[PDB]
Design a protein around this ligand. Structure first.
Ligand code: MG
Ligand code: MG
Ligand code: MG
Ligand code: MG
Ligand code: MG
Ligand code: MG
Ligand code: MG
Ligand code: MG
Ligand code: MG
Ligand code: MG
Ligand code: MG
Ligand code: MG
Ligand code: MG
Ligand code: MG
Ligand code: MG
Ligand code: MG
Ligand code: MG
Ligand code: MG
Ligand code: MG
Ligand code: MG
Ligand code: MG
Ligand code: MG
Ligand code: MG
Ligand code: MG
Ligand code: MG
Ligand code: MG
Ligand code: MG
Ligand code: MG
Ligand code: MG
Ligand code: MG
Ligand code: MG
Ligand code: MG
Ligand code: MG
Ligand code: MG
Ligand code: ZN
Lengths: 105, 135, 60, 134, 52, 86, 122, 50
RNA sequence: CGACUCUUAGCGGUGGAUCACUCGGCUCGUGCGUCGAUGAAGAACGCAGCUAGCUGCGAGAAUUAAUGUGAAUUGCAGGACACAUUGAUCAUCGACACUUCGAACGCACUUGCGGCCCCGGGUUCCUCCCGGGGCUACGCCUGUCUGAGCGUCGCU
RNA sequence: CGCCGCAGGUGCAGAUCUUGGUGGUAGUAGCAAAUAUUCAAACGAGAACUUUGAAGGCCGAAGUGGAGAAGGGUUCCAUGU
RNA sequence: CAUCUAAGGCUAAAUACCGGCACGAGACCGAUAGUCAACAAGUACCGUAAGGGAAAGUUGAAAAGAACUUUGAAGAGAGAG
RNA sequence: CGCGACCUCAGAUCAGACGUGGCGACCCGCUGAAUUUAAGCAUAUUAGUCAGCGGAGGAGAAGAAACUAACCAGGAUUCCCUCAGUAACGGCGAGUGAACAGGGAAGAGCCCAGCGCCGAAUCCCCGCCCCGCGGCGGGGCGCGGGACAUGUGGCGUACGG
């Protein structure tokens, strides 16, 4: 029963949520494992960049973010063509390629 | 369709679950045929199947099976994947083309049920309460 | 009187006794004791003698 | 202190390992300090105990400079029995008193092929450690 | 196990506490109040050369 | 009479020892174990009885082969090789 | 006085079997002594004779098994017990040869476009 | 009954052997912690499984 | 004077609370993440000088071999063991071995009964008996051999 | 263990509360279905109950007799406490 | 107009893990607690069966575990150690 | 009225392999309630949850768009934060309820059929000899057999060839 003023609340705890609860006690261990794997991979590829291949300059899709620019999946086929790079050699030299992206501007 | 197997048509419960007839099995007859072929010939791996004919009461499917231990399969790449242990009895787990259709797997606004790998995967991920360490 | 293995039948008992002690036997009666061991009574040949065979075995 | 993440410091775990230790490391556990003269003759400090070496008890009821030869290494009870370290029971006869080997100092070592090799390894390791320290 | 053992403190408050502790260690009344036996220490903010 | 008097009639064993699983659940008149379901290939096992599942799960017995497999895993299932002779 | 597998191995099967038979006879007479009162020494020798029988049998079986392995060395078909006993799952795997061989298209891909070792200037 | 199977007889043989007291010298063992035989079975007191 | 009863104390019983101890849990985290027809999980039956349970093991039976270690094991007995003309014990465990059921596999079992092929003994090699050894389950793939069809043909 | 803070599986007379132990009742109810015992002796520390013998009685052959099935599983049989 | 090219197939990483093997730790519990199970515990025992399922830790540093005398048949005492 | 070829079938203790059963915490495919809430109760809810069945692996599933968007466009999958207790559903009651974009973790792409072209170039098995045994490989030889033109291998797959 409600008592005096207060928000009308709808808790979603009618469905035996106790059996499916995600506890995050292994969060710092997960962070350490991720860091160690990062260091191991960077050690494995010694002169190459540790982060990964160069990603393209890409504008954000919707009207909320189109003023902003982020990184894309890979350089387009047309970009590679006019840059003079074979699309099967770009990936080996460390360039991400996104075949399914077409240019409009 | 799949008639519900209850004695004398009695489903003791609320009238919403009183249906016996007009019920449909959630997997297609083609996937059923693939399941039966694989279950009988468990030593083989089901690849795919195709419709070959039907009458009023029966449907006929021809099913392609691969012997995972024949040397013509094991020494040939591009088919070595079917011999991997994780690829056994795929039809019982719905990995064939026919068995995959019933799962609702795909891309688009139409397929928001199977985000994460499967319906149960999505349901788990959505209905699990993520209790962080810091709240 | 011998305690023989539970799986040995009378023919095997007769052969084994005859070869082990180089003797001649008439018949074998077989009973399984309550505790599980098989006990075989072996009648010797009349020309042979259980007393001195037991002497040479060392059970006397 | 202790820094190895694979080495436990739990009291209960350590006690479990100690009391359930197999015999071949119960021998290592039952190790005794050498006398001053032995610690000078050999560049080693302690030595695991043996059947026929002569010790002297340094703690408890049976202290003294008397040199008694071991006659028993009762590893299950983690004790040893010594020649004249005994005690007379009620009926008239006598038994030995269990003594932890850590409460004695070895004065003479029952030398054979193996003991000399153990002494050699220990002295070599000590020399290596001190020469690294210098 | 879901008892919220961890607490998150504001970063500004944490730095505030560090500043207060650093300031407090420089008062001989407070450090002697902790019982740290600072009687013949030449100067309470004790600084030594980097040779140590 | 349903009480003590009727209890004097029970002298015919219904269940007996099952060759699999060693329990006195082998229904004689039905030729089927009540605990393992012996003529059936698969073991009779149910999730509603977790206590009964743990009474007979792997490791509640002897594990004669698994306790050697576990030991061999640490050295990688080596065969055909022997330690260096003295 | 004891019997050692160390020096039991230089002998032929025939005298090995004779030694085993003598040990069996000794054990049988020891069992007779056990059931007819006997003595402590005879009772304690039973374990020793049993281990001696086990050592002789072990040497016999090992000799036979290595001879059989020598016989089947290089043959296309071997007895199952002479085949490796790794794991049922591990024996069904694809061997090194067929897990390493690749398609001609894959080989052409690798020949033409290998992975280059590179770096980026700051 | 007199009419019994070989398997039933084998089972009863094991039970008969298993129903006997502990050896005297067991108490002298180091860390014995065993008082008597707890698994003693009397035929008229507790009936067998089979 | 006592008996009985009540209250309080001393002491002694019954009882096993409290307190201290902890080779046990519970919770979290990490690293691997490995069963089985080459017979699994599970079960049954057995194995110690004296041993019923727990543990260990499979007729080689509280264990064989090998390697490391290096004088014990131990409740009593007994007995090796120059510890180098090689070694108690324990550990590791890669060689060997691993009874009966059990997916369980010749048929069937709350019992028992076969069939084929070799070897040995009575036989005195021929086929009866006894003993030993190896096969004898279902489904399915590729190949092999034997085949069936007034199925479609060809020659005759 | 005191003092300053911190965190609780933190305070028991009840719940026909749970577990364990203990009283009065109380040396009380009771050891009353199917006729029955007695004499001497032996062993034995100890005899109303054992054993032997002598009596008197019962089951009275659809038995309180002799054997079996099912079930029990060593209860069978000696010897000792 | 925009977008993709269904009805064939493969693919590591980030991810999950209350069963298994081997480990480390704790502001947790301290024997009516903590797992049912600190101990011969899925044991004893119950039910035809599916299944149900306990109780149960502590001499002492060392057995040095009370020699020997004495009453009783012994239990059990009294001295002594 | 016999003998061959092919097709479709059958047998075999034929030569050589493979499957079965166990565990099932995590995962995949099904089947699937009611207690409970709604202060009653039938849709709803519990819940695609418990129970039931099947199939795996060290992870599994997914996965390289018949996508999202409507922008000055993004670009496989999976996971975390957020969107969001929102859009929406609902005896529009109780209650239920995502997705896109943004930031991160990780990042990897590809192969067939077909269309064609290349004297079937293709593959399996059996013998003989040599080098290796370690997960049985290579080389050579066989007028040795078989599969296969009802289609094996090479180029080649929407990023055009
Ligand atoms: Mg309010
Ligand atoms: Mg990154
Ligand atoms: Mg008979
Ligand atoms: Mg190709
Ligand atoms: Mg008795
Ligand atoms: Mg008192
Ligand atoms: Mg050995
Ligand atoms: Mg019958
Ligand atoms: Mg015709
Ligand atoms: Mg409380
Ligand atoms: Mg109270
Ligand atoms: Mg209280
Ligand atoms: Mg109150
Ligand atoms: Mg009365
Ligand atoms: Mg009366
Ligand atoms: Mg009369
Ligand atoms: Mg009368
Ligand atoms: Mg009668
Ligand atoms: Mg009797
Ligand atoms: Mg207590
Ligand atoms: Mg408890
Ligand atoms: Mg008495
Ligand atoms: Mg065959
Ligand atoms: Mg309601
Ligand atoms: Mg209500
Ligand atoms: Mg109601
Ligand atoms: Mg409803
Ligand atoms: Mg379920
Ligand atoms: Mg399965
Ligand atoms: Mg996968
Ligand atoms: Mg896939
Ligand atoms: Mg819902
Ligand atoms: Mg083609
Ligand atoms: Mg595509
Ligand atoms: Zn069963």
């Amino acid at each position: 029963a409600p008592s005096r003023n207060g928000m009308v609340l709808k808790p979603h705890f009618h469905k035996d949520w106790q059996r499916r609860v995600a506890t995050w006690f292994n969060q710092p261990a997960r962070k350490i494992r991720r860091r160690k794997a990062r260091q191991a991979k960077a050690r494995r590829i010694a002169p190459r960049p540790a982060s990964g291949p160069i990603r393209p300059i890409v504008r954000c899709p919707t009207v909320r973010y189109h003023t902003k620019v982020r990184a894309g999946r890979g350089f387009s086929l047309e970009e590679l063509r006019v840059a003079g790079i074979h699309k099967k050699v770009a990936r080996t030299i460390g360039i991400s390629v996104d075949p399914r992206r077409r240019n409009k501007s | 369709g799949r008639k519900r197997p209850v004695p004398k048509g009695a489903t003791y419960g609320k009238p919403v679950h009183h249906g016996v007839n007009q019920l449909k099995f959630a997997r297609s007859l083609q996937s059923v045929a693939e399941e039966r072929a694989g279950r009988h010939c468990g030593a083989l791996r089901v690849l795919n199947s195709y419709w070959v004919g039907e009458d009023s009461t029966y449907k006929f499917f021809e099913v392609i099976l691969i012997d995972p231990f024949h040397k013509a399969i094991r020494r040939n790449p591009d088919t070595q994947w079917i011999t991997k242990p994780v690829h056994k009895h795929r039809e019982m787990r719905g990995l064939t083309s026919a068995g995959r259709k019933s799962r609702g797997l795909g891309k688009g606004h139409k397929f928001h049920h199977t985000i994460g790998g499967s319906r149960r995967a999505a349901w788990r991920r959505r209905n699990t309460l993520q209790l962080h360490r810091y709240r | 009187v011998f305690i023989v293995d539970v799986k040995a039948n009378k023919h095997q008992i007769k052969q084994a006794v005859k070869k082990l002690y180089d003797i001649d036997v008439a018949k074998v009666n077989t009973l399984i004791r309550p505790d599980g061991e098989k006990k075989a009574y072996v009648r010797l040949a009349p020309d042979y003698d259980a007393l001195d065979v037991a002497n040479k075995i060392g059970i006397i | 202190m202790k820094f190895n993440p694979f080495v436990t410091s739990d009291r209960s775990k350590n006690r479990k390992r100690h009391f359930n230790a197999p015999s071949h490391i119960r021998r290592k556990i039952m190790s005794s300090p050498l006398s001053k003269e032995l610690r000078q003759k050999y560049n080693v400090r302690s030595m695991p105990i043996r059947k026929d070496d002569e010790v002297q008890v340094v703690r408890g009821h049976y202290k003294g400079q008397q040199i008694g030869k071991v006659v028993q290494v009762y590893r299950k009870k983690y004790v040893i029995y010594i020649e004249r370290v005994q005690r007379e029971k009620a009926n008239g006869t006598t038994v030995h008193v269990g003594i932890h080997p850590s409460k004695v100092v070895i004065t003479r070592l029952k030398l054979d092929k193996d003991r000399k090799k153990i002494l050699e390894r220990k002295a070599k390791s000590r020399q290596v450690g001190k020469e690294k320290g210098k | 196990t879901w008892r919220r053992w961890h607490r998150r403190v504001n970063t500004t408050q944490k730095r505030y506490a560090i500043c207060s502790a650093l300031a407090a260690s420089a008062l001989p009344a407070l450090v002697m109040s902790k019982g740290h036996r600072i009687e013949e220490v030449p100067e309470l903010p004790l600084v030594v050369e980097d040779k140590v | 009479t349903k009480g003590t008097s009727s209890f004097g009639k029970r002298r015919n064993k219904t269940h007996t020892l099952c060759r699999r699983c060693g329990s006195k659940a082998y229904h004689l008149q039905k030729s089927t174990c009540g605990k393992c379901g012996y003529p059936a290939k698969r073991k009779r096992k149910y999730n509603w009885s977790a206590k009964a599942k743990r009474r007979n799960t792997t490791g509640t017995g002897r594990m004669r082969h698994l306790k050697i497999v576990y030991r061999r895993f640490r050295h990688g299932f080596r065969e055909g090789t022997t330690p260096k002779p003295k | 006085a004891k019997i050692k597998a160390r020096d039991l191995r230089g002998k032929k099967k025939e005298e090995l079997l004779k030694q085993l038979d003598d040990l069996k006879v000794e054990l049988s007479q020891l069992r007779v002594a056990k059931v007819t009162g006997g003595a402590a020494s005879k009772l304690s020798k039973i374990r020793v004779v049993r281990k001696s029988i086990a050592r002789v049998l072990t040497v016999i079986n090992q000799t036979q098994k290595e001879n059989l392995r020598k016989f089947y060395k290089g043959k296309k078909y071997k007895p199952l017990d002479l085949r490796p006993k790794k794991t049922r799952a591990m024996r069904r795997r694809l061997n090194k040869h067929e897990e390493n061989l690749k398609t001609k298209k894959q080989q052409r891909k690798e020949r033409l476009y290998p992975l280059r070792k590179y770096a980026v200037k700051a | 009954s007199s009419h019994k199977t070989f398997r039933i007889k084998r089972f009863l043989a094991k039970k008969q052997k298993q129903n006997r007291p502990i050896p005297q010298w067991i108490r002298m063992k180091t860390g014995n912690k065993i008082r008597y035989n707890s698994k003693r079975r009397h035929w008229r007191r507790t009936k067998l499984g089979l």
